[PDB]
Amino acid sequence: LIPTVIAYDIYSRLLKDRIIMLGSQIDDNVANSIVSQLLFLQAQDSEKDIYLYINSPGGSVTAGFAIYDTIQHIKPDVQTICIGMAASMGSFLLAAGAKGKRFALPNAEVMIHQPLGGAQGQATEIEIAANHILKTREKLNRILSERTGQSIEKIQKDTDRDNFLTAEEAKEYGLIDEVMVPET
């Protein structure tokens, strides 16, 4: 049961202050919702910052790029904050936040790897599927290189296997700008 506040559900109350929740696996439904929220908020105010909360294991690459392109297209800066974890396409979207406004809390987990998929059937069908996922990885690595400041060659090497980063290591890597440390 998601609690009510007064009548907003808790997540709708957060959207009132320009906070969007990416708190699940990324499919087309999640992407359609977030994309729509981004369009609504920029229509309300094109100057004020938007805040993208990220607690996600990733998911669909095309659904992820739906969110990515909408972030870049709109005028407002979209801040990103990783709380809990950002894995796979979640960490890609974390790195896609406005330059200087990509954050994570100290114990947040960031993971990067190569895209996952499958193919079955004739040899030429397997080839088409293989060329597709390789082009998709090159596309992902190229953008990640541009937003982190790392070389495409280094991204390729570091995303070959599952690579778990602490929030601080994600800052060192260039996936975020600051680790949001708590007040004593």
Place this chain on the structure above:
Amino acid sequence: LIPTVIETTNERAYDIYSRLLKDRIIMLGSQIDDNVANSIVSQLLFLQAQDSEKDIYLYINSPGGSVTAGFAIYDTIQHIKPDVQTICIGMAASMGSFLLAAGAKGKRFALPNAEVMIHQPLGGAQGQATEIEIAANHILKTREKLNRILSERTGQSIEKIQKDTDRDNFLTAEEAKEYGLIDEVMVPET
């Protein structure tokens, strides 16, 4: 949950997608079945009734689906008076890319990292030889119907469409523009 948006009135609450429909935006954000087609067809009929002059905006993030359900949407877009803009965000595959190509001439768009896929229709038949023949003749005629309309809306020949849609053909937004499926790749606002 579908997020609720609330705006200060002289406080009115909307579900996000109904609020988008208020500004003439229709969401094609799922696999195309009869239910999705009926909704989109009804929305198109509602918006043209509200205003026959103002543009309609069809958001497309779909893997495609039913060809007949797709043609329900297609024919309704062609029948109504206002221009239907199409924008691919995320992906448009199969019937989804067909509907992307069906948007108003000069108003078919995609964001730079959107994926466009085209291929021949999928189906199945089972039973007697004459039943398989009927099913085969039907899906072949459906492909001719699709390819002929794609040729008209892209400028590509029916022979080239046949060859390019024989297997899965993935296109970038820029390649989709070059192919004639869209008119412009939308680049970021300043």
Place this chain on the structure above:
Amino acid sequence: LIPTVIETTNRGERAYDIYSRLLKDRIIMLGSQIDDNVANSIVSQLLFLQAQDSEKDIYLYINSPGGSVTAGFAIYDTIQHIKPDVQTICIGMAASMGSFLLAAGAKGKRFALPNAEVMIHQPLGGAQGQATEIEIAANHILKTREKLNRILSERTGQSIEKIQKDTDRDNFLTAEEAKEYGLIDEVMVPE
């Protein structure tokens, strides 16, 4: 998720789900497989609309693969019973009992959009158990076909003999071929 529409009136904002808004302008949706629930709803909508106005036309949207013959005949009989002319429009597809109901619209007011698909075939069914039980089931589905073909003959203008031959297997028709056959009156071309 059915989208909501918001109309401003002189009393205030009025919210409708999209399909209920269309019902306000006498548009009924047959947009699914025909079962008893779908027939019960459509039959009730027809009775509601004729009570509001017995002269005005009603519009039956048809995007259906067909389904139950008895549920189809619930809709058919209610269309013929009420005073209002029921226009039918095929958008997407009309197959089996869906195409039967497309042909059941008011004379001169049966439509299809250019790329809509119309299919006609003989009814489907099953029988299991004793020889006498299989006989009863076979006689029942055969009389149901004669019933369907007789009414389809009357509404298309085709003979019962020609309808029998043409519905022996799956027979897919274009919107123009459906017009030529007599299943619809006009193809509604775009302006």
Place this chain on the structure above:
Amino acid sequence: IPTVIAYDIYSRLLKDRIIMLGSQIDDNVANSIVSQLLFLQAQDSEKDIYLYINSPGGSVTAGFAIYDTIQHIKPDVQTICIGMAASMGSFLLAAGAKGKRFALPNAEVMIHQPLGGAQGQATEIEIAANHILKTREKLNRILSERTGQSIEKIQKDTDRDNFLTAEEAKEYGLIDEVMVP
């Protein structure tokens, strides 16, 4: 399967040149029958072989393995339908040596068009459709040759399930005699 003084019943029948087609026709059944036919040819090229048919048919290719082997070998292969011959089994019943195709009085003979399935792309469905259509043409041409009926008549008579009595099968040309007591 009982033993007889020591042979299993079907191996004893094979000793007297009798082959059992008593099940659905798959590749395993075809491989067995084809091998038995070749074996019986080597034992004696002159003496008749007797193919017992109680079968609902099955695989068309597996059926043609049996068909071609029957027409290839030197000995005449008598066919006898006991119980039923359907589809490919009734095709093989008709494949027996001219004048030596039989059925018992209450045996059931059924003929229909070949059954199959296709799934995937439109061009793949087209290929499967052209395949099964040409397979029917191949079956109907051979059935026309062996029954004496026209290809046009067989096409119409195999459109749906067509059940025949033993006497009707004789009149059709699927068999030569109804074997009385």
Place this chain on the structure above:
Amino acid sequence: LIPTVIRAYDIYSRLLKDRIIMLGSQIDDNVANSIVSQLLFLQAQDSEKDIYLYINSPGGSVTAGFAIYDTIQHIKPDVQTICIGMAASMGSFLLAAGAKGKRFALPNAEVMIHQPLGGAQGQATEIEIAANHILKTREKLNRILSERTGQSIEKIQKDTDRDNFLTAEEAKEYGLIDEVMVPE
């Protein structure tokens, strides 16, 4: 069926009106997203007043737990923790994460601690990556648990090797809570 109280509040939403958040289930990303959003909502309402985290949980996801942990430490209000029924694993970790001097348990509440659980599959290098990750996760957990209990990291490692059930009184002695809240 959750009962309602009359504005109409479901019982949990009514408790949120008095700054009480419920952690009453297995910790997954949905529970974390909700609790994190409630913590942000309550500190926005008032940054001085105490928040009260009810804990009846068997634990669950370590990343989802750390989403709640970091959000507790980030916000200005003291987050009190009270164990009613049980707190195990990540739930007992979040119990120890409460404001200093404001971590409670009712007399018959059960507190359990152990090392984190997981799974690994595939190639030898993939298994190595999974093992190094879950070992770093335990070090990360034991470090924080050491600081908040006052026990040595060597002692935490030993006592979390197997399932270790503790009474409310034993949890106070261990440093997981501050007081056993006895009935007046």
Place this chain on the structure above:
Amino acid sequence: LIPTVIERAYDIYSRLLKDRIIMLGSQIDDNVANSIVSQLLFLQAQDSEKDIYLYINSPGGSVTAGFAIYDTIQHIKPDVQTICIGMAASMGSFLLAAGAKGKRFALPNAEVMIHQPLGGAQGQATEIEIAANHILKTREKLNRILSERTGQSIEKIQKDTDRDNFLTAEEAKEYGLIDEVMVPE
């Protein structure tokens, strides 16, 4: 399933909560415990002096979830009356015995059952040992509290809870699980 009553419209159970009646009418899991614990905190905040009425028609369930309800009953100031209607089995009968002194009731044909706690253990011998020591502790914890509230000895409870022990309303009164059999007028 649940009917509405109008006066402000309430579902039947929410209307009962307005008169300080809490329903324990199902298997005791964490969700049921969380709900009841929240209702007890709501009612004591509304009025810390007026009685609360815990309806008990439960087969029991989770011991920790039961102890969530138990500890919340003992902590709050209001008297929590307990009334067994239908049945109170296992942890339900523990909570029936946990009601305010002199205000634990049962209707004449209500069923009260008591037994030892149920559980599981899998894996290594030391893991089984830890699991066995835990549930044995949990039983002592339950038996010690039952002893205090019933007036029966710990060793007597041990023997009487070894197997399933069904009791009538009158036998539950005689045992000390309830105070009165609430007879009809």
Place this chain on the structure above:
Amino acid sequence: LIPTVIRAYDIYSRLLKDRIIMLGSQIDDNVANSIVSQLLFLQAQDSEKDIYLYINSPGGSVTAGFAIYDTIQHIKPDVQTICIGMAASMGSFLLAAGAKGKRFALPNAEVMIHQPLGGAQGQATEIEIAANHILKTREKLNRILSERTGQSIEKIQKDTDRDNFLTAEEAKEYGLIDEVMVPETK
């Protein structure tokens, strides 16, 4: 029920006594091992006399097929290939692998040729490896099938893109077999 013949042989073991091997099922490793072992046994009995490989098979494992293929080529005796019923995929490859001039099909036998089928699942680089493997396997198959049919590699590529069913006579024209085996004289 495989019938016995009378020493008591099962029917297939009796056929092996006259140098006939049965490829009458889907090609898996078990079938390949048995056929490879039979081929080694028959060459040891007699290194000159022809072996007969009956083929009624829908194909199967490519590696299992190449176990059979390589053993045929390695041994001294000619392996006649005899298509009865049907030869599809790797079955039709093995049909084409029979001794030159001694590849047969019966008049109504079905021969089908198409590209190899497979699967890939996991990371992008794992999918790439699986794709490169099956593509190289196709080139290997096409190159050999080119050499034995007399058709160009690009013609084989085009004609095996989809399912391609050939009659016995069309298989002879294509070069997959040498003769449509006629009935024996009597």
Place this chain on the structure above:
Amino acid sequence: LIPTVRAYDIYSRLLKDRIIMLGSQIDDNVANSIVSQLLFLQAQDSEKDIYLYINSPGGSVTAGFAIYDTIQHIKPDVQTICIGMAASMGSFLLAAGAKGKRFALPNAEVMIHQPLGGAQGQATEIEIAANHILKTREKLNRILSERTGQSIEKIQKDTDRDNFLTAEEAKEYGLIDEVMVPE
């Protein structure tokens, strides 16, 4: 149906001429059988060569090492011949044949990769499983280095992913000695 050829089943006849079949996935049942055949054949004759046929996708590493150790323990040379395919522990055993007597037919497929496994439970239990499989890989890679003549660094890198090799490439790599060409 295994054909008959006294009357022997085909594989028993091959065993009479000292040919052992490794034609399936390597489990404990297959290893126990092959190990027993090796022990039987060396007892019949310690000097005459044994021939290990390999058409296997591999399987259990321990079951593979059962066969490996028995090959090295016995006096007779165990020839290895890859027909069809040798993958994983199957290709390890192909490389384990007598020096100069490891073969493959021209179109045989050879695959090498790192060992596969699983682990579940506590962090310390996962650690133990990780330490074990890594030791198993080093154990395997060291023997490959010795029998191929390649450096262990090269073996480590080349077995990181699935690495398919032709018969000629297997010869060049050192996994086999000759590609057995047809007469």
Place this chain on the structure above:
Amino acid sequence: IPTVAYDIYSRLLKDRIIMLGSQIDDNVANSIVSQLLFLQAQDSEKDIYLYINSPGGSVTAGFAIYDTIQHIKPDVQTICIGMAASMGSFLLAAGAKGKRFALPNAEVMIHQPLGGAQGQATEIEIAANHILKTREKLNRILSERTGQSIEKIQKDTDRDNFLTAEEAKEYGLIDEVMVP
């Protein structure tokens, strides 16, 4: 299973070789126990050879094999080929003193016994006491045959402990590593 007339394992049994090459259940125990009794009846002085390629299994089934090895007069040699784990490693250690072997790459695993218990608290207690006694029984015997203390065996069997053949020899589970 190839033939040589004898099936391969029956031919090995003719030379007093018993195969423990599978998971240990009652059926495997009954077979091996019966082979041990049969081989004693054939010759009470000549050695028996127990091949061990097993992941272990039932402890009572393992103890059926153990007691029968100890009961009979002939020495029972044990050789680990492939792997011996759990009860398989226990039975490996139970072989005749000075005649317990393993090939170089053979794997030896030792760990505490696994079990399960469901129901009432007193039933869980009875199951827990039983498996604990079973561990004491196993550790006491493993102490006698390895030469290690009961405390060290308790420590080293708390978790999965994978040993090489040489490490198993050093531990006392075997006497010699058979070199080629």
